[PDB]
Write a protein that binds this ligand. Structure first.
Ligand code: SF4
Ligand code: SF4
Ligand code: SF4
Ligand code: FES
Ligand code: FES
Lengths: 239, 164, 59, 241, 688
């Protein structure tokens, strides 16, 4: 389960209903068929997760009931299994969301770094809380669990749905202060591309840190792997 | 080693039932019914000797033939008799003397106990052998690993691999 | 028992037991030991006091 | 939704076929171990604990880092060096979880002296886990940290089996009430009893993963919890009189 | 053998168990009934309830006896402190979110959860938080769903996926928010959809027609049989006084296991409407209430007023063997030889029982790896039999069908749809013959709608030819089977309730009788019931035959008496009276005996045992109640002896082998009067 999805059962809407119309594009159909080839034909049901994901980008960032029906008819499986899988996984959104999907880790290693400060800054600037969307349909805020970037905590991942499957982007933004995330959001709003990863270092190499969640304090100390890379070598396998 | 519910008063009821002299008593057909003193027409009706089957509502098996030696589980019943309703209230009205005495009291460990009881009382009786439960499972889903064996769709064909 | 609600430690009802003892036929009842434990004088006479109350088990 | 063992994946795995599931790190080091020798791999670490390991260090650390280091290295050496020490100094350290989020945490007394080893952290009633370091200082609410971990586990439980599915929310609410102090002394023993109830009684080990952190939390900081419980009376019982 | 029976120890008791058995099964063989919530006998192993945890030596963790295989030399303990501690903890985890709905829950009194909590649980609770609130779901008018009561034992999902084969239900959500049902608003299309409530161990799934009606202990349980079809499912009847409240299935592996058709589950409601309680005789103003003496005298006068060849007797679907034989003796004693059956093919020759029975038996059918269907729809002829067919399908049994391709809830091969396709298969033109010729235990089954064809002899001859060519009948095996959809047909066949050749000829030239008697018949054709002819009806429900009747005798319904009914395999079964007679109703054979005395020819028997003994003298196997004989086989001599009937009325190669059953939910007056079947029909009609 995730935000913006309080129901595990279908709800009727003029946008999402039994009369909803969806069909794959030729590029999307080709990509799905290529994905189909990764599994044996007698086990054709195993490719449901990537197909659901691709349909999710194709529709614009969420999955409709008609999309699930079409996927089930494509994979020759019962719709009930498709509904179960869709309700089982966090990334799969069953309701209409904004053009950009903002996800924040709430796990304790991120919390200690000042996660609530970043959340509060996002709430104060974008004007919406968790499970909410801007009136312009631009930014969608959501809360996530550990995203595997704890050394660069706090971190935020933002999903783009403005360029479809081929232009889909899932970018990590790490080592953030309220100023950092606000400027990232503003750059996205004006049409620019914010730089990925950490805002004060390249990767997980030793560097400074965020003290109190508000200020980056650089620090100098011992760093490894600073010499020339090791040459190829193998020992004598014989005896 | 002998252990068949060996921590209760039932053992004290197992014995005193096999007392010598007291275990050799016997009476003829309809003879005990003479001693009853009840109206003679009681013996004219038919009776059912059986053990009620397990209810579908529950998985319980205590009140079933499974624990036969543990609890008396053979019941004697009578054909239901004419019943109607009270004109003033609507409550069910009947005149059966043998309406509930069997389903509430008459309980027996074995069918032969009820057979002897009816014979000494003269009650004409029917025997209905209860169906035996099956413990052996089906070939499919026989073991927990059968839910995830290769029988579901056959062996995976290695034809969609790169380079086929 | 407000927060410690375990019951097996306090199921006296379903834990009583009856046992069929051995055949008490070839036993030796020495009445000598029986009558050796009895008093012989006005003194040395011991009586079992009347219990004040029945067991309560802390309640 | 996991299956039950027996059967095993090697006996019956994917599509009913033999299958072995392995970690990325264990697989990656194999050619290097094969090329550089099991003798060279065994040159590091203590007995039955040979080799190196990738360590992820986070929390209130001056230099958080994902670094490779020899096994059996002390926590104090591993953190003061290669990570810049504790923010505010080693004396400002409060507690550290050395193996991710499923293993019991260790206080400052246990941490100072213990090594990063499977057979050293286990005897400390903890675990090497994933060798992931989380560091908390004295200004931190440890109860809030464990409660957030419990909330994470509650959201992460699949719910296939009864005990975990129904007890994750119970544990979360217990911890949340503890955070506000709206709990009682005997309810701490009640919480420990519930943790014993879940542990080792479920389908998979996720129940153990959720039960263990609170167990160590109680065992090493029961004074903090009782102090919080009593302290709520200074802000809740004043209106009751 | 390599010791197919291995040995273990449970609480220091040596118990011999078959290989592949579980610790649950071993403890069952040990005489211990371990608490369990998700495991079922007829379903796959789920093992999520955690209620089967036991202790084994050299094992630090409790093991899932519902799933743990037993190893040789294993030691199992079931009364240790950790066992009870785990049981109590599991019960507590069950009850923390469960809503306090027992006063309004209908399963109170027969709730496995409640009894297991009483026995293996504690008495107190330390949970004071807000529970999880679950919205209810709509699956149709048969089952009332209270989803908040669900313990997620997954039994519904496994049952729907495996037994029904619909696989329409699943588990949505995750964790605490895991939810049960269908993501969309769907109506449960399963025909055996009422078994889920019985399989549901809680009040989450409840019978909507039975909801809030009465309590389990208020009922008197009467073991009965199902008469809605020809399979004869063993059931129990629960009633409060004279009124039937619910009907439930009971265990019979050789017949129906633990399953019941919803038609046989919900048609008890009709017993409350259009009921005949008093004798009626048509006067100048019309039918009026009259005494049994008056009605019997009028019937006797009408019967004696006409010649013996002007009297016809017809047997309905629900007439018992006793009434059938009594009426047959009555009409024979007065020189009448016109007999008809509402189940059709009244003129079919009945000399060898095997020719019109299932020689493989229902349980012996499970030994066949290949099954052939010839113009039958077991789904709508016997959904329980269809479920057993699906169970056979689940472990490698292949099925072939010759007839109309219909949904049968499992994959199969359609050989054809007309007798020409059958002839091609017998000739060698189809690959299915060689599969039949290579199968070790092939099976062929033919429905009753085939027997309703005017060219039934030709179809039987072709089927016999195919059986001979494929060796379907050989030593130690008989894959030939004949099924039916009505109970009274088998007893009529065995007792020889067949019209005389003189009456057959009289029908051939078109002779029309004047005295017509109905034994609970309401689906007669117009050709056997001429208009303007006097009609004497006996029954227990006001229907079409009753309306057109001139004299009506209120008979006994199957829920009020104990009649003999033999299923299509030839196993003798009897019903049982659960409630007394309704109104002034009388015993059917008693009614016929009274009429016989009034007319002037008394029947030689005056008791129920006497007429049953008369039946036994007619056919010995009637005495064997709840058993079956092995029918004799006479090879092709029977077919070569009925060759003339094949010559006359030759084969029609164009008519498809269809099923005459067009309305599953309504086949007889009781089904035609039941409100629940009408509600289901409307629901199936409101989906479009
Ligand atoms: S312990 Fe929790 S996550 Fe693991 S199988 Fe059981 S319910 Fe699912
Ligand atoms: S299912 Fe059983 S325990 Fe649950 S509310 Fe109904 S009667 Fe009570
Ligand atoms: S609805 Fe009933 S059968 Fe289905 S999972 Fe819940 S308790 Fe089990
Ligand atoms: S704690 Fe947030 S990414 Fe791991
Ligand atoms: S029967 Fe053992 S856990 Fe369900």
């Amino acid at each position: 389960t995730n935000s913006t999805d309080i129901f595990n059962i279908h709800k009727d809407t003029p946008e999402n209903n039994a009369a909803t119309s969806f069909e794959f594009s030729e590029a999307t159909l080709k990509v799905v068929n290529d994905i189909i080839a990764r599994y044996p034909p007698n086990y054709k049901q195993s490719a449901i997760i990537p197909v659901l994901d691709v349909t999710q980008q194709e529709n614009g960032g969420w999955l409709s009931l008609a999309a699930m029906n079409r996927v089930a008819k494509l994979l020759d499986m019962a719709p009930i299994r498709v509904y179960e899988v869709a309700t089982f996984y966090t990334m799969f959104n069953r309701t209409k969301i904004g053009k950009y999907h903002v996800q924040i880790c709430g796990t304790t290693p991120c919390r200690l770094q000042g996660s609530q400060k970043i959340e509060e800054a996002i709430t104060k600037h974008l004007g919406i809380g968790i499970g909410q969307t801007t009136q312009d349909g631009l930014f969608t805020l959501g809360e996530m669990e550990c995203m595997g970037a704890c050394v660069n905590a706090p971190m935020v991942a933002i999903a783009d749905y403005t360029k479809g499957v081929s232009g889909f982007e899932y970018i990590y933004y790490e080592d953030l202060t309220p100023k950092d995330i606000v400027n990232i959001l503003d750059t996205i709003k004006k049409g620019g591309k914010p730089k990925p990863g950490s805002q004060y270092r390249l990767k997980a190499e030793p560097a400074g840190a965020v003290h109190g969640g508000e200020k980056w304090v650089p620090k100098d100390g011992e760093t490894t792997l600073t010499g020339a890379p090791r040459a190829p070598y193998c020992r004598d396998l014989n005896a | 080693e002998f252990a068949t519910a060996s921590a209760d008063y039932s053992i004290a009821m197992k014995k005193a039932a096999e007392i010598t002299g007291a275990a050799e008593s016997a009476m003829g057909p309809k003879e005990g019914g003479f001693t009853a003193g009840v109206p003679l027409d009681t013996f004219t009706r038919k009776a059912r000797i059986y053990a009620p089957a397990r209810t579908a509502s529950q998985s319980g098996l205590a009140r079933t033939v499974d624990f036969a030696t543990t609890t008396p589980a053979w019941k004697i019943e009578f054909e239901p008799t004419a019943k109607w309703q009270n004109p003033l209230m609507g409550w069910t009205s009947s005149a059966d003397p043998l309406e509930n005495v069997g389903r509430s009291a008459l309980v027996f460990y074995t069918k032969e106990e009820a057979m002897r009881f009816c014979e000494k009382l003269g009650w004409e009786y029917e025997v209905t052998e209860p169906n035996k439960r099956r413990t052996q499972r089906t070939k499919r889903y026989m073991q927990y690993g059968d839910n995830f064996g290769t029988k579901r769709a056959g062996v995976p064909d290695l034809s969609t691999l790169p380079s086929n | 028992l407000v927060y410690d609600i375990k019951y097996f430690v306090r199921d006296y009802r379903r834990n009583n037991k009856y046992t069929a003892r051995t055949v008490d036929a070839k036993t030796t009842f020495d009445f000598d030991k029986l009558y050796a434990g009895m008093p012989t004088k006005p003194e040395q006479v011991k009586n079992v006091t009347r219990p004040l109350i029945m067991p309560t088990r802390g309640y | 939704k996991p299956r039950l063992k027996p059967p095993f994946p090697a006996g019956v795995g994917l599509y009913g076929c033999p299958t072995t599931v392995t970690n990325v790190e264990t697989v990656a080091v194999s050619p290097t171990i094969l090329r550089r020798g099991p003798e060279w791999f065994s040159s590091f670490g203590r007995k039955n604990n040979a080799g190196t390991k990738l360590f992820c260090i986070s929390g209130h650390v001056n230099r958080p880092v994902t670094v490779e280091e020899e096994m059996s290295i002390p926590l104090k050496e591993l953190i003061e060096r290669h990570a810049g020490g504790v923010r505010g100094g080693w004396d400002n350290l409060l507690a550290i979880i050395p193996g991710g989020s499923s293993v019991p945490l260790l206080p400052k007394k246990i941490c100072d002296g213990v090594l990063m080893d499977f057979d050293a952290l286990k005897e400390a009633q903890s675990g090497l886990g994933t060798a992931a370091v989380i560091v908390m200082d004295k200004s931190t609410d440890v109860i809030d940290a464990i409660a957030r971990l419990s909330y994470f586990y509650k959201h992460e439980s699949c719910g296939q089996c009864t005990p975990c599915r129904e007890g994750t929310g119970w544990l979360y609410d217990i911890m949340t009430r503890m955070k506000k102090g709206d709990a009682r002394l005997e309810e701490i023993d009640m919480l420990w009893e519930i943790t014993k109830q879940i542990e080792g009684h479920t389908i998979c080990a996720l129940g153990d993963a959720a039960a263990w952190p609170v167990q160590g939390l109680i065992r090493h900081f029961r004074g903090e919890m009782e102090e919080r419980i009593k302290s709520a009376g200074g802000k809740k019982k004043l209106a009751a009189t | 053998p390599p010791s197919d029976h291995l040995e273990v120890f449970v609480n220091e008791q040596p118990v011999k168990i078959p290989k592949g058995s579980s610790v649950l099964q071993a403890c069952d063989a040990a005489g211990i009934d371990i608490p369990r919530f998700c495991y079922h006998q007829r379903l796959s192993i789920a093992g999520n309830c955690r209620m089967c945890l036991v202790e084994v030596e050299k094992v630090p963790k409790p093991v899932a006896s519902c799933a743990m295989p037993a190893g040789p030399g294993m030691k199992i303990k079931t009364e240790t402190p950790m066992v009870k501690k785990a049981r109590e903890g599991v019960m507590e985890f069950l009850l923390i979110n469960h809503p306090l709905d027992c006063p309004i829950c209908d399963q109170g009194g027969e709730c496995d959860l409640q009894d297991q909590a009483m026995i293996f649980g504690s008495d107190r609770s330390r949970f004071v938080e807000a529970k999880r609130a679950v919205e209810d779901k709509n699956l149709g008018p048969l089952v009332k769903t209270v989803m908040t009561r669900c313990i997620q034992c997954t039994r519904c999902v496994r049952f729907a996926s495996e037994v029904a084969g619909t696989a329409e239900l699943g588990v949505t959500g995750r964790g605490r928010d895991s939810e049960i049902g269908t993501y969309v608003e769907k109506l449960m299309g399963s025909e055996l959809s009422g078994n889920v409530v019985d399989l549901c161990p809680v009040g989450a799934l409840t019978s909507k027609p039975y909801a809030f009606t009465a309590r389990s202990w208020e009922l008197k349980g009467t073991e009965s049989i199902d008469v809605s079809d020809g399979l004869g499912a063993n059931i129990r009847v629960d009633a409060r006084g004279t009124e039937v409240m619910r009907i439930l299935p009971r265990l019979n592996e050789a017949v129906n296991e633990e399953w019941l058709s919803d038609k046989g589950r919900y048609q008890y409601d009709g017993l409350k409407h259009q009921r005949l309680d008093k004798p009626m005789v048509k006067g100048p103003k019309g039918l009026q209430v009259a005494t049994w003496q008056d009605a019997l005298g009028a019937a006797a006068a009408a019967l004696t007023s006409a010649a013996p060849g002007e009297v016809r007797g017809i047997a309905g679907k629900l007439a018992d063997a006793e009434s059938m034989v009594a009426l047959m003796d009555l009409l024979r004693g007065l020189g009448a030889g016109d007999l008809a059956h509402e189940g059709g093919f009244s003129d079919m020759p009945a000399d060898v029982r095997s020719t019109y029975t299932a020689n493989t038996t229902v349980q012996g059918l499970e030994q066949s790896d290949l099954v052939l269907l010839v113009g039958t729809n077991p789904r709508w002829e016997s959904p329980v039999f269809n479920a057993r067919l699906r169970k056979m399908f689940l472990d490698g049994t292949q099925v072939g069908l010759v007839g109309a391709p219909v949904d049968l809830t499992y994959k199969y091969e359609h050989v054809g749809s007309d007798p020409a396709a059958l002839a091609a298969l017998a000739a060698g033109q189809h690959p299915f013959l060689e599969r039949l010729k290579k199968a070790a235990r092939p099976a062929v089954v033919v429905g009753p709608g085939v027997l309703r064809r005017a060219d039934r002899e030709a179809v039987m001859k072709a089927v016999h030819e195919l059986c001979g060519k494929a060796g379907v009948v050989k030593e130690g095996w008989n894959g030939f089977n004949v099924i039916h959809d009505t109970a009274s047909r088998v007893a009529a066949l065995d007792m020889g309730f067949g019209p005389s050749a003189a009456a057959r000829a009289r029908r051939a030239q078109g002779a029309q009788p004047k005295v017509v008697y109905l034994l609970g018949s309401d689906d007669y054709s117009e050709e056997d019931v001429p208009e303007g002819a006097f009609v004497i009806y006996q029954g227990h429900h006001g229907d079409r035959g009753a309306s057109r009747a001139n004299v009506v005798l209120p008979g006994a319904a199957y829920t009020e008496k104990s009649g003999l009914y033999v299923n299509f395999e030839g196993r003798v079964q009897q019903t049982r009276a659960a409630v007394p007679l309704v109104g002034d109703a009388r015993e059917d054979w008693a009614i016929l005996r009274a009429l016989s005395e009034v007319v002037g020819k008394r029947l030689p028997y005056d008791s129920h045992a006497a007429v049953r003994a008369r039946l036994a003298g007619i056919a010995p196997h009637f005495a064997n109640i709840d058993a079956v004989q092995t029918p004799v086989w006479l090879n092709g001599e029977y077919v070569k002896g009925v060759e003339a009937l094949a010559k006359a009325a030759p084969l029609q190669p164009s008519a498809p082998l269809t099923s005459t059953i067009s309305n599953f939910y309504m086949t007889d007056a009781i089904s035609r009067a039941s409100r629940t079947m009408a509600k289901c029909i409307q629901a199936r009609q409101q989906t479009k």
